[PDB]
Amino acid sequence: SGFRKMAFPSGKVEGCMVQVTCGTTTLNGLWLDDVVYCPRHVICTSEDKLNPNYEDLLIRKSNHNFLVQAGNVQLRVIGHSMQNCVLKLKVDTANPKTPKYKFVRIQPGQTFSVLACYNGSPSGVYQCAMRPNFTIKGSFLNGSCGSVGFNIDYDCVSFCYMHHMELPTGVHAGTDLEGNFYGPFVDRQTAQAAGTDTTITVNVLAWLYAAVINGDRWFLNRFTTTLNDFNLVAMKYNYEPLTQDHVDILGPLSAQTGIAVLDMCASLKELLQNGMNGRTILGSALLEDEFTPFDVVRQCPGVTFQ
Amino acid sequence: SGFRKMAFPSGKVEGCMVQVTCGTTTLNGLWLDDVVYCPRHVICTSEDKLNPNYEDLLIRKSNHNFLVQAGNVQLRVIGHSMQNCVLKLKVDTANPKTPKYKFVRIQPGQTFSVLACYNGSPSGVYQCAMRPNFTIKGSFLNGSCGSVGFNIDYDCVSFCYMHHMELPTGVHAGTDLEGNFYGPFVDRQTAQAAGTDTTITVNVLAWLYAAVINGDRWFLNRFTTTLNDFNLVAMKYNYEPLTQDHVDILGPLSAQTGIAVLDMCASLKELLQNGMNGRTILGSALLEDEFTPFDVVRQCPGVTFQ
Fold it and tell me: What positions constitute the catalytic site (chains A, B)?
């Protein structure tokens, strides 16, 4: 019983975190086999960030200009390259603790675990969701760039996020492990503002299903609605449109509770129109949208197959 | 920037989780040096739990009656003993991944990270607070008994909780690593109900300070109160009494915000009597009490020493 925001165990990722220093700037890198991945803006001075030419700065740098330290051992850089916004430093030593890994690009609305690190040392782990405006609301202090977001798919650690930037609103922006930013953000000091955000509708419904599984049933009603007329209310309250694919994803939760997805939509409609009536749902007085349907299944297994 | 519920990296604890099997019952154990710690109720059948005499059941058990598995490797048990409510199985082999560790007994209101495990394999990590009624609001499924709570204070893992049981209200109860239950709970099927809970006042204030640091200022007022007049309202809404020790602990946050602790108490006073009027504080519509002042300082460091 119980439902909590839960991150994946970070051990396999901790064994890959290193410290990368170029000039006066120090951040975190991801050491997989004989390659260290880190944000390319480490090669920039404070003045370079105003208008950096990364192709020029990369040529000007030498292998010895990059100091990579895995804890107490210094790793010798023997090659440096750039894939989009990520710097790739080939090192002398292959990481003996490299896990089975993949590079994946997640979609807005999906969640992952963030291992916040400083000086190449992990500091904390928490779950984050890619918002529709392609930002994440994490907790980062100075020296956190290079921290990675990941999911564990049983035996494979799928890295999906590398932390690059903090926006003026306090939210955070970064790239996938191929150097491609999530959203329209660039790794330079220019006027970039996160777009207006929306609520992840399919995540709210899955979160309501988790409540029903854990005994919270006051918000349930006898009403049913159609996908079209629910999406009308959803747009009226800045909710993402609900698609048939989203309904299919919610299939398992609807199967174990016996509550049709459109019946939960009728309950969600009334909650949006009349509020929460001063009550709470899974320890929240707001509708939570940072739990994916799989995230719910992870903590709410059915009784169908025990 | 940002403020999130953040757990410690679980790697050092992941390397200590093992599987302990007695008869048909399988749960998790903590492998430190040559001793495996697990809940003693693993030696009970389903009928035994109704009225177990653990001293007798231990006599009937042999070393070979306990099957301990460190992942895929079977550990040879060479001794079984009982320290209060925890079973201690001495094994032939010392765990090479044992970190610098201590056993500590935490206070109500203090927080720790829970590494939820199943069949000796870590599944997730999240932050929990010891409630005043000596329960925790975690997320546990079948086979989670033996999961441990911990804090890391620079290379040292302080174990403070082992999960034993779920109460009828859905909350969870367990012991320290010396086998002493938190609260008046016993490892037997009896009429045991968690007492009525109260809100951790010093944690709410620290959380309100974190909100001010992160830009939330609407709940602030020019009102002032005394510790006596605040505690009258606190008891009136089932809040823990605020002591002078609690006020001193909040000293750094009050200095960093320029808000006197008793002025924040006045803000909490008005928030308790009339609510938040449809606004939010750090993305919550409730007053959060699972963040200790140290947890806030950890995520909101001052500029005094840069």
Answer: 41, 145
Interface of B with A in 2-31 (CB under 8 A): 2-12, 14-15
Strand spans (E) along chain A: 17-22, 25-32, 35-39, 66-70, 73-75, 77-83, 86-91, 101-103, 111-118, 121-129, 148-153, 156-166, 172-175
Consecutive H or E run containing A212: helix A201-213
Residue window 41-80, chain A: list those with CB within 8 Å of chain B: none
Written as six digits, the tokens of B41 are: 């109720």
Written as one letter, the residue type at A274 is N
Size of the A and B interface in Cβ pairs below 8 Å: 119
Give the 3-state secondary structure of residue B227.
helix
Q: Are A126 and A115 in contact (CB under 8 A)?
A: no
Which positions 210-249 of A are in contact with B (Cβ < 8 Å)? 214-215
Residues of A in contact with B4 (CB under 8 A): 126, 128, 137-139
CA A71 to chain centre: 26
Q: Mark whether B41 is an active-site residue.
A: yes
Resolution reached, in Å? 2.2
d(CA A118, CA B271): 36
CA distances from A297 to A2, A306, B103, B281 (A): 13, 13, 34, 29
Burial (CB < 10 A; 0-12, 13-18, 19+), residue B76, is exposed
B14 vs chain A: nearest CA distance in angstroms?
Answer: 7
A302 in contact with B, Cβ within 8 Å:
no
Q: How far apart are the first and last CA of chain A?
A: 15
Write out chain A residues lying below 8 Å of B125, CB-based. Answer: 6-10, 125
- The length of chain A in residues reads 306
Nearest residue, CB atoms, A3 vs list B10, B128, B139:
B139
Nearest CA in chain A to B210: A139
B163 in active site: no
Domains and CATH numbers, chain A: 15-91 (2.40.10.10), 201-299 (1.10.1840.10)
Per DSSP, the three-state class of B52 is coil
Tokens of B215: 């830009």
